[PDB]
Symmetry: C2
Subunit: 81 residues, 2 copies
């Protein structure tokens, strides 16, 4: 299990690094990205929307990795807690 | 968000190391610890059950750290997904 966790943690670090780089390049905060994606915030002028496909994919990867880590953690539950 | 995640990842590595040490001292696999805690495996003789108090505390901390990450990830939901 700890082998599985360590691999996922490494992948999460990588995913975070990618997202931070993409946000830096896009000149956008993570918060603003989410608000734009959900339809609440207008695209700021200056921001290149062409980054959004990759950002979306990487954010989905991060979510999936966190979910996968939690699935491993289910093996540590005793009596479901 | 990302500063929080980075700290949690570091705390998870620390927690894992602490558990590995306790398991080494106890001469117990993580798998066996869980099997014994859940009632499925008898206490092997030679194993000092006194280790179970700290092992349980540290495994609880590891679970709570992973849960903290789960909760952070909830902020990345868009349209509830
Ligand atoms: Mg094991």
């Amino acid at each position: 299990m700890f082998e599985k966790i360590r691999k996922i943690l490494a992948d999460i670090e990588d995913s975070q690094n990618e997202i931070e780089m993409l946000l830096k390049l896009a000149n956008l905060s993570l918060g603003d990205f989410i608000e734009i994606k959900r339809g609440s915030m207008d695209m700021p002028k200056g921001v290149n929307e062409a980054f959004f496909t990759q950002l979306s994919e990487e954010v989905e990867r991060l979510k999936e990795l966190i979910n996968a880590l939690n699935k491993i953690k289910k093996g540590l539950l005793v009596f479901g807690s």
